[PDB]
Every structure is written in C-alpha cells, then in structure tokens.
Design a protein around this nucleic acid. Sequence first.
RNA 1: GGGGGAUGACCCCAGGCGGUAGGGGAGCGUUCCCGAUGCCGAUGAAGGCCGACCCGCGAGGGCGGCUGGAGGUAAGGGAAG
RNA 2: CAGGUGGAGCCUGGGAGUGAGGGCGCGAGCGAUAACGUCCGCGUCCGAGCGCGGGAACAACCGAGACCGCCAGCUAAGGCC
RNA 3: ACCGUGAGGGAAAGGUGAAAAGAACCCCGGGAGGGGAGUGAAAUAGAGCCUGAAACCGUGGGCUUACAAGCAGUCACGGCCCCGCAAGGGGUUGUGGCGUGCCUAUUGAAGCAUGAGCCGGCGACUCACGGUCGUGGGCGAGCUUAAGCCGUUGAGGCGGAG
Lengths: 113, 202, 50, 117, 101
Amino acid sequence: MEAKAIARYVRISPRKVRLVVDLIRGKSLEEARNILRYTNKRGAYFVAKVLESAAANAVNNHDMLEDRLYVKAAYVDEGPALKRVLPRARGRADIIKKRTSHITVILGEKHGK
Amino acid sequence: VYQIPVLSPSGRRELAADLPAEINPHLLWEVVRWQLAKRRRGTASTKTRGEVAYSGRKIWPQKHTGRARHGDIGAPIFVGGGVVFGPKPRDYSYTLPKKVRKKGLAMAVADRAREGKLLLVEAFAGVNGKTKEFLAWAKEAGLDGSESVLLVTGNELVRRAARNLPWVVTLAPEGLNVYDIVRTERLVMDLDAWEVFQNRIG
Amino acid sequence: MKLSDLRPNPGANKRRKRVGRGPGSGHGKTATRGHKGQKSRSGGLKDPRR
Amino acid sequence: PRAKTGVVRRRKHKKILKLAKGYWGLRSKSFRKARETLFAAGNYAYAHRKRRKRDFRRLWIVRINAACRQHGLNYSTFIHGLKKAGIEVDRKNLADLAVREPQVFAELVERAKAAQG
Amino acid sequence: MFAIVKTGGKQYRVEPGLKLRVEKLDAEPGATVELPVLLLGGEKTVVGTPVVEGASVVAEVLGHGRGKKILVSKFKAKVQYRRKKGHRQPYTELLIKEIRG
RNA sequence: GGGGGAUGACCCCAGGCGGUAGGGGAGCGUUCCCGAUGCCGAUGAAGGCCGACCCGCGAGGGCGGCUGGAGGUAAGGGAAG
RNA sequence: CAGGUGGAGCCUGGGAGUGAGGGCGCGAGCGAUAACGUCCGCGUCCGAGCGCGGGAACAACCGAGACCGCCAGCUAAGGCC
RNA sequence: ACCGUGAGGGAAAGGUGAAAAGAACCCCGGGAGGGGAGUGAAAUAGAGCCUGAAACCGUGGGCUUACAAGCAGUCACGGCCCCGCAAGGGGUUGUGGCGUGCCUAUUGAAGCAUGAGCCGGCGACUCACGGUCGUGGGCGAGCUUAAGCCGUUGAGGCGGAG
Ligand SMILES: [Mg+2]
Ligand SMILES: [Mg+2]
Ligand SMILES: [Mg+2]
Ligand SMILES: [Mg+2]
Ligand SMILES: [Mg+2]
Ligand SMILES: [Mg+2]
Ligand SMILES: [Mg+2]
Ligand SMILES: [Mg+2]
Ligand SMILES: [Mg+2]
Ligand SMILES: [Mg+2]
Ligand SMILES: [Mg+2]
Ligand SMILES: [Mg+2]
Ligand SMILES: [Mg+2]
Ligand SMILES: [Mg+2]
Ligand SMILES: [Mg+2]
Ligand SMILES: [Mg+2]
Ligand SMILES: [Mg+2]
Ligand SMILES: [Mg+2]
Ligand SMILES: [Mg+2]
Ligand SMILES: [Mg+2]
Ligand SMILES: [Mg+2]
Ligand SMILES: [Mg+2]
Ligand SMILES: [Mg+2]
Ligand SMILES: [Mg+2]
Ligand SMILES: [Mg+2]
Ligand SMILES: [Mg+2]
Ligand SMILES: [Mg+2]
Ligand SMILES: [Mg+2]
Ligand SMILES: [Mg+2]
Ligand SMILES: [Mg+2]
Ligand SMILES: [Mg+2]
Ligand SMILES: [Mg+2]
Ligand SMILES: [Mg+2]
Ligand SMILES: [Mg+2]
Ligand SMILES: [Mg+2]
Ligand SMILES: [Mg+2]
Ligand SMILES: [Mg+2]
Ligand SMILES: [Mg+2]
Ligand SMILES: [Mg+2]
Ligand SMILES: [Mg+2]
Ligand SMILES: [Mg+2]
Ligand SMILES: [Mg+2]
Ligand SMILES: [Mg+2]
Ligand SMILES: [Mg+2]
Ligand SMILES: [Mg+2]
Ligand SMILES: [Mg+2]
Ligand SMILES: [Mg+2]
Ligand SMILES: [Mg+2]
Ligand SMILES: [Mg+2]
Ligand SMILES: [Mg+2]
Ligand SMILES: [Mg+2]
Ligand SMILES: [Mg+2]
Ligand SMILES: [Mg+2]
Ligand SMILES: [Mg+2]
Ligand SMILES: [Mg+2]
Ligand SMILES: [Mg+2]
Ligand SMILES: [Mg+2]
Ligand SMILES: [Mg+2]
Ligand SMILES: [Mg+2]
Ligand SMILES: [Mg+2]
Ligand SMILES: [Mg+2]
Ligand SMILES: [Mg+2]
Ligand SMILES: [Mg+2]
Ligand SMILES: [Mg+2]
Ligand SMILES: [Mg+2]
Ligand SMILES: [Mg+2]
Ligand SMILES: [Mg+2]
Ligand SMILES: [Mg+2]
Ligand SMILES: [Mg+2]
Ligand SMILES: [Mg+2]
Ligand SMILES: [Mg+2]
Ligand SMILES: [Mg+2]
Ligand SMILES: [Mg+2]
Ligand SMILES: [Mg+2]
Ligand SMILES: [Mg+2]
Ligand SMILES: [Mg+2]
Ligand SMILES: [Mg+2]
Ligand SMILES: [Mg+2]
Ligand SMILES: [Mg+2]
Ligand SMILES: [Mg+2]
Ligand SMILES: [Mg+2]
Ligand SMILES: [Mg+2]
Ligand SMILES: [Mg+2]
Ligand SMILES: [Mg+2]
Ligand SMILES: [Mg+2]
Ligand SMILES: [Mg+2]
Ligand SMILES: [Mg+2]
Ligand SMILES: [Mg+2]
Ligand SMILES: [Mg+2]
Ligand SMILES: [Mg+2]
Ligand SMILES: [Mg+2]
Ligand SMILES: [Mg+2]
Ligand SMILES: [Mg+2]
Ligand SMILES: [Mg+2]
Ligand SMILES: [Mg+2]
Ligand SMILES: [Mg+2]
Ligand SMILES: [Mg+2]
Ligand SMILES: [Mg+2]
Ligand SMILES: [Mg+2]
Ligand SMILES: [Mg+2]
Ligand SMILES: [Mg+2]
Ligand SMILES: [Mg+2]
Ligand SMILES: [Mg+2]
Ligand SMILES: [Mg+2]
Ligand SMILES: [Mg+2]
Ligand SMILES: [Mg+2]
C-alpha cells in the first residue's frame, strides 16, 4: 500500500520549497528525516510536517511499518496567489504576489523481503 | 376544387364548390410569413454608447500616457460599454396586398378539399360546453383525433367544447387565417361558417 | 399542404445579404472599400449626385 | 436575439493546435504561433512533393552513372544507347536493377553500347 | 523470376504473389486483367524494343478505393490569401498471379 | 461548351481553372421563431476531453470511448446583437 | 475587301476599385552625353507572379503563366572536374 | 466600496446537494491542512464546493540531445518505443535535401518600417424612412390603401381621404 499527506495553502513560494522536496525524493524515511533536520531552508519545517503526517497515516491507517517506508513520490503545486500592493517611487504601486504551495508527500513500503 | 362532403343529420351528401383548380405554394408561403411577422412584438432592445450610464469624461490624456487612446467607457470597445447596431424596438408588420390575402385563403382550402381532408357539417348534436359531448360527435364523424383538426364555427358552445383537445385548433369564421390551416391536417366547417367564407372571398 | 412543405420560389427570399466578415468570402478585411481615404472613412463622401 | 461567440471560437482553435502537435515551444501551445507555423508547413509540403520527384531522379541517376561507370560508360552515353535501341524502359526508377540484377543491367549496357558504338 | 510492367504511366517490378496498388483502372473488383505490357524478364535476354511482345502478366482487380487524405494548402503572405484543399487519390489493388511469357 | 434525350444531375468528349484592390456565384456554422400538446434524453441532454475511423474540396458533419449530470431539438422554412 | 468564334466585339443597365506606381529596353527633354535622379512617349515585366528553374544570395535580367495527386518521360534558360 | 477639497466619478462580486445528511470519533499537526471513519446515486459535488476549457506551473513514463548553426518547419530514408494476427498505423528524431515569421502599410519588407508577452472572453457595414436598379410573386388600364373603426387563444376584416 501507499499513503500520502497534503499540506495546502501553505504560505510559501512553490519554487522555493520545491527545492527541498526534490532533496528527499525516493529516499528512506530514516534518511529523509536526517536531511530535513539540517537542511537550512524555511521549506524544511513545512516538508518535515507533511512527511511526518504521511508516516502517521501509513502505520495507523494503512498498516505499513515505519521501518520500511520510503518517499515513493513527492511534489509541490502552486496554490492561489496573495496579491499585495507595493508602493513605489513617483506614485507607482506594483503588485507583489505572496505565493502559496500545496505540498504532497507520498510514502510506500520498500520492496524489501 | 369541387366535390366536398357534408354531414347533414340526414345523410352524408356532397356539395360542389368553385374553388381554385391550382395552388401557388408561395403566395401561401408569402401569406404565412406575413401573418407570423405582423404578430412579432419588436421588443428586443439595447443601449448605444449614448444611452449607457457612464460619464462623458476622457479616461487618460490623448498622448504620453503610454497606453492606447480612449474617450468615455461607454465606447463599444469597452466591456460594459454601449452596443453597436444592436436591436431597437421595431414593428415587423407589413401590408400584404388584400387580393393576395383572399386568394391565399381560397387556395389554402382548395389544397385541403383537393386531398379530401375538408368536411362540411351541420348543427352538431353533442353541443353544449362539454368536451365529452363534442368528443363523441367527432367520433361519430370519423374525427377520432387521428389527425390535427381546424374546427370552424360561430357556435360558442361547440368551440368551448373542443377547445381543450390537444389535436383541435378552434376558430370563429371571421378568423379564418391560413397559418391555422396548413398546421391542421384536417379542416371542418359548419355551413354558416362556410357561408361567410364564400363571401370573404369574392 | 404542410408547414414543412412551404418553401418559396428559388429567387424570392434571396437573402444572402453581403458582409465584411472574414477572408475567403472575398468581401473581407476592408469590406468592399479598398484602401482609400474619404470614402473608406465612416460618414463617407459628400452627396456624390451633386 | 444575441448570438454570443459561445463555443465556436474554442473549437476552431483546437483544430489548429491539434495539427500543430509536436511543434517546438509555443508553436504547438499558442494558437497564433501554431497557425503561423502551419502556413509554412502548408507551403513546404506542396513544394516538397513537387520536388521529391526531383530528388529521387538525381539519386537514381548517380547510381546508374556509377554502376555503368563499372563497365566503362558515362551515364550521358548510356541514355543514348537506350534511346536508340528503343529500350525506353529504365524509367531511371528501375536502377534498383543495377543493385539487385547486375546480370540484367549488364545486358542493357551491352545492348546500349551495342547500337551506337 | 520477375518482370517489369507498365501502368498509370509508371513502370513497376512485379512478381507472382505480390499485392500492389496502382493508378486507378477500369475493371470489376474481382475481375481479371493482363496488361499486355512488359519490358523485362527475370531470366534476361527478354528486354529488347520498348515492349517485348511474346509475353504479358495477369492480375486480379483485388478492389478499388481512395488512398489516405492529404492536405494541399497554399498561403501567400501580406495579401490575405489562403486556400484549403483535401485530396484523396483513387487507386486499384492488384495481385500478380502469372508471368505469361 | 457540345453531345449523350439521360432532362436530367448521368455518361463519355474537348477545353478553361496564378492572382492584390474589387465584381459575381454557391455553401458551412452560431443565437432565436414556426415545425412542437411533437420527437431525442437518466439505458444519461447541453458542454467538456481524446480519436490513427467514416462522409464533405473546404467551412463543417458523423461515429466511438472517457468526462458530465438536465436538458436538447431533425427534414424543411423564417429572423439576426 | 477578306481571314479571324474569342473570358473577343457592340448596345442598355447594376456594383466597383483606381486616380502615390515602380524597374528594365528603345526615342527625347531637364541634369553633368552624373544619380537606384527627374519629366514625357512606345513597349514590357513587378505591382497582383516575394509561386517555379537559372542568375552564389536578390520584386521586376534569362527560362517559364503553378487546379490536385505520382519514388514516370521530354525539354527551356543555364549547365556536365 | 473606492477616487475626488468639491461639483463629480464610480467597480468588482450569482450556482454544494433531492435533502445538511455540512462530515461524530481516531491518527499526524500549535494551527492551517490532511489521512482514516462516516453521510451521499456521485465527495477531483467537502463548503476557495455543478460543469471546470486555454494560457500557466509540477510529478511520472516513451523517444531524443553535450563537434554543432537556427522563422524551428517540411520531404525523404533510416534507428528506438507503442497499437494490431496481419500488412499496416501512432510517438519520437539521427542524417540528407529544400526553406527570409504573421498582420499592416508600401514602387518595394525577413526586413534594422507599424502592431502584437501568452491565453480566454467583449469587440466594427445595422435600422428607420425615402430613392434607384434588380428579383419572387399578386392584380393589370389599372394597382394600392393611410389614420382610424369592428373583431381576435399571437384570427382577421372593414376603411378609397390619398
Ligand atoms: Mg507621493
Ligand atoms: Mg453621454
Ligand atoms: Mg450617461
Ligand atoms: Mg452615472
Ligand atoms: Mg466633455
Ligand atoms: Mg509599451
Ligand atoms: Mg451593458
Ligand atoms: Mg402598417
Ligand atoms: Mg391596420
Ligand atoms: Mg386545443
Ligand atoms: Mg452571397
Ligand atoms: Mg453577415
Ligand atoms: Mg463574393
Ligand atoms: Mg477580393
Ligand atoms: Mg464596393
Ligand atoms: Mg492609408
Ligand atoms: Mg487600412
Ligand atoms: Mg492612397
Ligand atoms: Mg466624414
Ligand atoms: Mg463575437
Ligand atoms: Mg509531425
Ligand atoms: Mg529516354
Ligand atoms: Mg529475340
Ligand atoms: Mg515570405
Ligand atoms: Mg504586397
Ligand atoms: Mg440532361
Ligand atoms: Mg479538365
Ligand atoms: Mg493555369
Ligand atoms: Mg482563380
Ligand atoms: Mg458567378
Ligand atoms: Mg446556415
Ligand atoms: Mg414548442
Ligand atoms: Mg438512474
Ligand atoms: Mg457516460
Ligand atoms: Mg442552447
Ligand atoms: Mg469533426
Ligand atoms: Mg458528450
Ligand atoms: Mg429549430
Ligand atoms: Mg434550420
Ligand atoms: Mg457584433
Ligand atoms: Mg471580317
Ligand atoms: Mg473582357
Ligand atoms: Mg458603373
Ligand atoms: Mg498621379
Ligand atoms: Mg509616371
Ligand atoms: Mg504602368
Ligand atoms: Mg514603365
Ligand atoms: Mg524589354
Ligand atoms: Mg539593345
Ligand atoms: Mg526613377
Ligand atoms: Mg537612369
Ligand atoms: Mg499596392
Ligand atoms: Mg503579369
Ligand atoms: Mg525575398
Ligand atoms: Mg525566391
Ligand atoms: Mg536562384
Ligand atoms: Mg534590382
Ligand atoms: Mg527570381
Ligand atoms: Mg520573380
Ligand atoms: Mg533528357
Ligand atoms: Mg541547351
Ligand atoms: Mg556551376
Ligand atoms: Mg480621499
Ligand atoms: Mg472622501
Ligand atoms: Mg465596469
Ligand atoms: Mg462559480
Ligand atoms: Mg439544487
Ligand atoms: Mg440550491
Ligand atoms: Mg499529538
Ligand atoms: Mg503558539
Ligand atoms: Mg478528514
Ligand atoms: Mg455508501
Ligand atoms: Mg466519482
Ligand atoms: Mg454517472
Ligand atoms: Mg476524501
Ligand atoms: Mg468514501
Ligand atoms: Mg469530475
Ligand atoms: Mg460532481
Ligand atoms: Mg476555484
Ligand atoms: Mg467544483
Ligand atoms: Mg445541479
Ligand atoms: Mg469544480
Ligand atoms: Mg487544465
Ligand atoms: Mg518530465
Ligand atoms: Mg572539428
Ligand atoms: Mg554528437
Ligand atoms: Mg546556439
Ligand atoms: Mg532542424
Ligand atoms: Mg511509426
Ligand atoms: Mg519514423
Ligand atoms: Mg539539414
Ligand atoms: Mg532536415
Ligand atoms: Mg540549406
Ligand atoms: Mg499592424
Ligand atoms: Mg505607414
Ligand atoms: Mg512609407
Ligand atoms: Mg516609401
Ligand atoms: Mg527583427
Ligand atoms: Mg521606426
Ligand atoms: Mg518589425
Ligand atoms: Mg508610421
Ligand atoms: Mg504589458
Ligand atoms: Mg482571443
Ligand atoms: Mg429600403
Ligand atoms: Mg431597395
Ligand atoms: Mg380593439
């Protein structure tokens, strides 16, 4: 079986957090944890939460044994945009968009004997 | 056309008639078109850039703004602006020549009489504003409602009767129009109604 | 006779008004107006019959 | 009655985009760039049928002119041989003869520089 | 053994047991037709003149039809001129049965 | 265009068929009306997404599957935002 | 007076567009027996043939007027180490 | 709402489902969010809720690419993958041949002349009354009514001033 957790409307830029997600793809849960703890990014925190919430769905909802699950799949999609006004010189007003991500960690049991 | 049946209470006699030998499947069409058009309401409308609610101010200056050039926001190019050559209320009626109105009416009957889908009648029997009464008379006239029927009489109670039949269109005799003949498969008149018809024409 | 059986004479309605729609029709883009100045302009020419 | 664009526009745009499958970048994704790209592929097709006929002849001829250059013969001559001998057959197409049926080919050459020597 | 034939103003290499599409003919889809035309035999020496006479090859009108549609389009730029035309080239399928020669 | 008298729509026959501004002629599709107290539709409408299939020169029309969940509307004519 | 049946001609009408042309050859004027200059006349091509072949490449020079298809043949200009 | 001292300007923004039956409880989490359970004919109908197109951004897979050069396509062959007995077809692109975007404006543009970031939706030859040709019909030494009056399930007829 495979299990997944999704953090949605997370107030962070996709392109930013996608960077650490790609860092755990295909790895054991044991390793992945050790990676996020010392990855120096704001995205670590969030991805950590999603991952741990995914495991906590495998063992308690799908029977998967924590010692055998890897990061089968992981991705982050673009949530809706927070458009905000940025006042500029000569009365301009730009619009910066505070971006938003949909983090999706998806776990599976390693095919170990 | 000539040979038309009559339901006398006595026996199904025949009555000859001076109806047009041939028909013009165009002036019939020209008449129907005229009917269906004079009855339109011409009630679609829209607002030009002048009747739209926006102010007549100019959006930006003509030049040096670095955008396109514009007047009001009622201009047709603007979303929410007025429309161009859209519908206004109009009268679709036109005065079709009277001779053609008459002639088409004869022809519309002749086309019925020719196919022997005309039947004249008298007095009825089951009259009185109950369809049940009518419906049996009709049954006893080969009008099983196997086909759409235009019933023409000046008898209120007879018109009251059949009025609710999903295959009957009822009409007083001065209301003889041709649209209400071509839809109907079958034409049925009382004699006093046939009489006036022979007077409208000629 | 029947309503489906109406239909007028082949000429008659004619309809098929002209346009200024696409290419292919031929009568497209400039719509019968040619590159032009005063006449390709909206309101048009002065009364040409005089 | 109003008649909105409605569904007509999306549909036409899909025909083109479908005909532009496999084109590079936007040329397959943007309607406008796809239509533009198509006109090109349109004329290039037409032009390249009319000139595919050309390209093969020039290919056929080389092989002939090489194969009969193994028997001491210009292509320029050979054709006259076949012209005269009435062997108006090679159609240059059947210079697969020169590769599959050398025996046959030789006979023709032999018959070619026969009449006219 | 093979032969070189001629039809549709073209000249193909046939050999008994060979389905082959050809410029449309006039015969019943399942008739029988020799094209009394030949220009070669797969045993040499037959070659001479345009067409060798003491020889021909027979085939069965396997059926007719229309080949795949190709789009021939034309575009002239800056002149608002585009044409779309669909083409399907009629053809007849033939089976080479005998080299009568 | 001429025959084929087939008056039809059908055949052989011979010609013409680059094209802007423009002229002319045929059609496709969109909204609405009559056809409708009808017909299609939960055994699935309209719309969407595919298709290497079928008919049309083309504009288009079909057909098949997936989606969709309540509408749609022939032949044949009419009017246009 | 004859040959000439041609997308020829003439008559009456409906609808236009165009009225910024350009290059080249030949005949002149202006210019400097200058200009991808200018202004006429006779032709032509481009315009509208920025479709094809040749000219290395190139609207108008040479060849040639592209309805569609073919992995058939002869050619024009031009070429064949 | 917002903009403007003011006169005044002036928007955007509708749709779960038949019915809230609007998700008790449990797990991860500070919450948000999710995973189970549960409701439902359907939960990518879960309330940023019918349908959910395109641009746009990701994940996974097939083909491909680091001695090549280009309006990005086309025409050939060939490799690799896929569908199908089958011949055949679909995807991809390695090499070879050919190839100066679209619109507009112009004598002339790939043009280093104009316009367009891309996508979706709104966006320009109409109508009335006259007139002039043509055309489909009616009646023809005649043709025709206007306003009105009568009638009428969207029924027509009378009305001859002009
Ligand atoms: Mg300031
Ligand atoms: Mg105003
Ligand atoms: Mg106003
Ligand atoms: Mg206002
Ligand atoms: Mg003002
Ligand atoms: Mg700008
Ligand atoms: Mg409005
Ligand atoms: Mg009136
Ligand atoms: Mg009146
Ligand atoms: Mg009724
Ligand atoms: Mg027309
Ligand atoms: Mg139009
Ligand atoms: Mg036209
Ligand atoms: Mg034109
Ligand atoms: Mg005009
Ligand atoms: Mg101008
Ligand atoms: Mg213009
Ligand atoms: Mg001008
Ligand atoms: Mg003016
Ligand atoms: Mg529109
Ligand atoms: Mg392709
Ligand atoms: Mg020869
Ligand atoms: Mg011999
Ligand atoms: Mg070009
Ligand atoms: Mg031009
Ligand atoms: Mg005939
Ligand atoms: Mg011909
Ligand atoms: Mg031609
Ligand atoms: Mg033409
Ligand atoms: Mg014409
Ligand atoms: Mg239509
Ligand atoms: Mg109805
Ligand atoms: Mg059901
Ligand atoms: Mg279904
Ligand atoms: Mg609809
Ligand atoms: Mg289709
Ligand atoms: Mg569907
Ligand atoms: Mg309808
Ligand atoms: Mg219709
Ligand atoms: Mg419009
Ligand atoms: Mg003469
Ligand atoms: Mg002429
Ligand atoms: Mg004129
Ligand atoms: Mg001038
Ligand atoms: Mg001049
Ligand atoms: Mg000139
Ligand atoms: Mg000149
Ligand atoms: Mg010359
Ligand atoms: Mg000279
Ligand atoms: Mg000059
Ligand atoms: Mg000079
Ligand atoms: Mg011009
Ligand atoms: Mg010319
Ligand atoms: Mg050029
Ligand atoms: Mg060129
Ligand atoms: Mg050249
Ligand atoms: Mg030059
Ligand atoms: Mg040239
Ligand atoms: Mg040229
Ligand atoms: Mg030659
Ligand atoms: Mg020569
Ligand atoms: Mg050379
Ligand atoms: Mg303020
Ligand atoms: Mg205020
Ligand atoms: Mg607004
Ligand atoms: Mg909505
Ligand atoms: Mg509801
Ligand atoms: Mg509701
Ligand atoms: Mg806890
Ligand atoms: Mg706290
Ligand atoms: Mg939940
Ligand atoms: Mg259930
Ligand atoms: Mg479902
Ligand atoms: Mg369903
Ligand atoms: Mg769920
Ligand atoms: Mg469930
Ligand atoms: Mg769905
Ligand atoms: Mg749903
Ligand atoms: Mg949304
Ligand atoms: Mg939804
Ligand atoms: Mg609903
Ligand atoms: Mg949705
Ligand atoms: Mg999408
Ligand atoms: Mg990928
Ligand atoms: Mg090197
Ligand atoms: Mg390499
Ligand atoms: Mg490079
Ligand atoms: Mg390339
Ligand atoms: Mg393939
Ligand atoms: Mg391939
Ligand atoms: Mg190459
Ligand atoms: Mg290539
Ligand atoms: Mg090249
Ligand atoms: Mg432009
Ligand atoms: Mg300009
Ligand atoms: Mg200029
Ligand atoms: Mg200039
Ligand atoms: Mg540039
Ligand atoms: Mg400039
Ligand atoms: Mg430019
Ligand atoms: Mg300018
Ligand atoms: Mg911008
Ligand atoms: Mg658009
Ligand atoms: Mg008028
Ligand atoms: Mg008029
Ligand atoms: Mg009244």
